[PDB]
Amino acid sequence: PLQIEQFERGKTIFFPGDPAERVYLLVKGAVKLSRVYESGEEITVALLRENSVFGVLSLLDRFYHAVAFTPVQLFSVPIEFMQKALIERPEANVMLQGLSSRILQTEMMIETLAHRDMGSRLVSFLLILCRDFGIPSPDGITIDLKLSHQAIAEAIGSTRVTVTRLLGDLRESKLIAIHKKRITVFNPVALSQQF
Template identity: 30%
Template sequence: MTISAPNPALPSPISQRIFSRKELIPPRQDLLWKIERGAVRTFTWSEQGTLITLGYWGTDDVVGYPLSRVNPYQIECLTSVEMSLLPAGFWHQAVDAMLLHIQQSEELLSIVHRKPVSMRLWHFLIWLSEKFGREVEQGRLIDLAITHQEIAEVINTTRVSVTRLLQQFEEEGMLLRHQRRLILCLIK
């Protein structure tokens, strides 16, 4: 579905699209996508077929094929997503969002190289809580449905290890589970 809607940060009218959960964003080398609502992940895969997550992106982030030299490159919707198209002639209006994209990519890169795996997982959960979280009575709720397998793909470990470590974190009082979501019990 394509609609036009005014947006003070971008030229008007802007073409907007709504994508369903698990839908792939069509590859376009001539435009970027500004996320108005929802969450996506960018990924590639190795020669052996192993999925490699490149990033998680949410409201106000800019994503797109022109931001990457990785091939293959995919953008997958993790939720229902509403996006605005940003043609090449207007990229200068998204400089702040592109700088944030670089910063978040580097944060994630630093996380995936931490050792041991338990530290890597914990820092990834904190990163997710800062990006997709909100304060609740018990701590910080990660308001994004993410599977143990998806977490494992990001931090380069197995699903079994993620499950075991999440159980350990729960036993240690570091996190709670609430309706298929995680709440980090962070010290304030």
């Protein structure tokens, strides 16, 4: 019973309103987990990285929306199989060690969406990306993803035009550079203290 899965950029993995059918664990790439509130608002709640489990909380129907933020590989199991499995085997202690990571990541979004100014929200969301997909580069740290202006706009609660003009401003402040949709952040620590 061994298998991986594939999803292109922007493909939702599950919709709100949908059955809570399976429970997934990321293997490569990035997933944008979001929640629809009784208001109808849909807000990013986490950008899950590798070794991240999702679709779990329901177990403990849906009001989350998981989309592939980048191309992703993930292993996935029915909810009733994780539900029986968690009872049978204790070592739940890996699931506790994972749910801490879910909290840590969701808090990292708290700091991103509480910025009120979209520039700081963007910068704060870029830095999440740097820790999670950064590689050292001659200029600085490069986020190794082909990133969409829409995708970012969606995540930070913005419009694409705003996201584009803000990246432009960052570029014209020689704070970042963009080469074939791959963002490079010259000085992460500086940028962070500035916002």
